[PDB]
Amino acid sequence: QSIDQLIKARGKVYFGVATDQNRLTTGKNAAIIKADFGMVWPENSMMWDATEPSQGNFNFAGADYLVNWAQQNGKLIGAGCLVWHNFLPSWVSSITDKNTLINVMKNHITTLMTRYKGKIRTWDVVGEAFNEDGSLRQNVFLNVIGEDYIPIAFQTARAADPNAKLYIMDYNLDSASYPKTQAIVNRVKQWRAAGVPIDGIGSQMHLSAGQGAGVLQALPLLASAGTPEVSILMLDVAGASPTDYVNVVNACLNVQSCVGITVMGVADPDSAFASSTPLLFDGNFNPKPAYNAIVQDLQQ
Ligand SMILES: O=[N+]([O-])c1ccc2nn[nH]c2c1
């Protein structure tokens, strides 16, 4: 049975998965997504390198394919990441002038969000903005613009598509005692008090074995920032233990503002961490014990 259908019956929005044209045309990915998942994110086709490889010149073929496939198959769409240090073209990284970088960043956000206006449920606007000690990461945006880049990004995104839910996301938010987890909460509270339109915090849960248990404390901490939504993103677990996966799912169920869960992929061989067999389907596209454990946990 379908973990998306089951999680919806427990009052959540979706169980989703990252994908793209290459996946959808191979393996059993499209069939599994159609049956078992309710939302898709572009794994890479919306990243900056992919969408704006030279200044002002956009590439939308790959993202368009994903968006169209999702619409044809009745799936919600999440997308990102609009502003982060990964997948960043060299032409962006070499900018030194504050006003230029603001305009570059605003044009990137507005162009992408306008193209898909009204079709995207969730946009991950800012990603990986924090250092492990909780200070802000000194990426090109912070170095050139300063800390205003985060409010500017969210303000620009809200104007481009007021219907989308706007998220900040990060990894290593999995322990409630870790400084990064505390810092994103405190800063999101401050930004929201200044009227910055941060609708969500997304937790990029690339987990090692045994880390599911701590998410039961970390996810309510993230929700305490007061955003209308929190999400679990990029989920995979080294070893794919049912205990870890069920602990992650129950953290979602326990946190009223947690709208859903997105796994990093469908089948183990297609993970960037394949040797850790960290996904819910094996290399034959058969569901693994963790998939069945999630089914049993969600059944009523
Ligand atoms: O949850 N995800 O797997 C996922 C993948 C790529 C993304 N880019 N922005 N947000 C993302 C979430």
Side-chain angles (χ1 to χ4, degrees):
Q1 324 143 38
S2 165
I3 56 176
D4 178 76
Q5 293 298 322
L6 292 167
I7 212 180
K8 283 171 156 59
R10 295 242 175 189
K12 299 306 194 173
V13 184
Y14 61 84
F15 221 122
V17 64
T19 200
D20 256 329
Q21 184 176 339
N22 71 324
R23 312 296 182 197
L24 290 167
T25 56
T26 55
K28 294 191 190 177
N29 299 298
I32 288 165
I33 295 170
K34 282 154 88 163
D36 300 331
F37 291 91
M39 188 162 181
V40 294
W41 270 248
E43 180 177 352
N44 191 73
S45 67
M46 203 72 81
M47 296 296 172
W48 200 315
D49 271 344
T51 53
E52 203 192 347
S54 70
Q55 187 169 358
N57 174 40
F58 294 77
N59 280 194
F60 289 117
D64 281 358
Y65 186 97
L66 184 281
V67 168
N68 177 253
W69 186 91
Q71 291 184 134
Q72 293 174 330
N73 290 283
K75 305 305 178 178
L76 293 169
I77 309 167
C81 181
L82 292 173
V83 186
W84 67 347
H85 68 128
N86 298 319
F87 309 108
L88 205 59
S90 299
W91 71 262
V92 181
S93 297
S94 68
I95 294 173
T96 41
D97 176 66
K98 174 162 174 182
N99 283 331
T100 298
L101 193 57
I102 294 169
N103 294 337
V104 161
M105 185 187 71
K106 288 179 71 180
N107 182 227
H108 187 76
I109 291 164
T110 300
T111 297
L112 267 63
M113 295 184 67
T114 298
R115 183 178 185 83
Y116 305 110
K117 192 179 180 182
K119 304 172 161 203
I120 306 298
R121 187 206 185 273
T122 293
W123 272 104
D124 297 324
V125 180
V126 173
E128 293 185 14
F130 288 82
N131 289 319
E132 297 309 303
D133 70 359
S135 62
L136 289 174
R137 182 190 290 274
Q138 313 204 330
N139 60 26
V140 65
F141 307 104
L142 193 78
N143 287 346
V144 170
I145 300 167
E147 65 170 299
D148 286 347
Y149 89 90
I150 291 169
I152 295 163
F154 280 99
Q155 212 54 250
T156 301
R158 174 70 93 232
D161 185 356
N163 178 65
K165 292 290 169 60
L166 310 179
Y167 283 62
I168 186 163
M169 65 178 194
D170 223 320
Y171 67 92
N172 282 353
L173 310 180
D174 310 309
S175 164
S177 64
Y178 194 63
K180 200 183 193 180
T181 319
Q182 298 281 336
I184 189 161
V185 169
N186 289 319
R187 277 208 174 258
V188 169
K189 288 185 190 172
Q190 290 196 90
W191 285 317
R192 286 181 49 85
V196 180
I198 308 182
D199 301 313
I201 301 172
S203 183
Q204 301 167 225
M205 281 198 198
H206 170 54
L207 298 187
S208 61
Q211 283 197 295
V215 171
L216 291 154
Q217 290 78 50
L219 199 68
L221 164 60
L222 293 180
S224 75
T227 55
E229 304 186 352
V230 299
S231 65
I232 298 174
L233 297 172
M234 304 183 194
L235 172 64
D236 54 39
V237 187
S241 164
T243 300
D244 278 321
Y245 263 110
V246 168
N247 279 340
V248 171
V249 169
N250 283 338
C252 167
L253 297 181
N254 289 343
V255 173
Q256 177 179 329
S257 63
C258 185
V259 291
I261 302 169
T262 302
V263 291
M264 190 67 255
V266 177
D268 281 339
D270 294 324
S271 179
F273 322 101
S275 62
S276 75
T277 63
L279 298 178
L280 293 176
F281 294 81
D282 70 22
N284 292 324
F285 288 97
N286 289 318
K288 292 165 61 179
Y291 186 93
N292 300 328
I294 291 174
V295 167
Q296 293 306 318
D297 187 65
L298 293 176
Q299 279 179 170
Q300 284 174 70

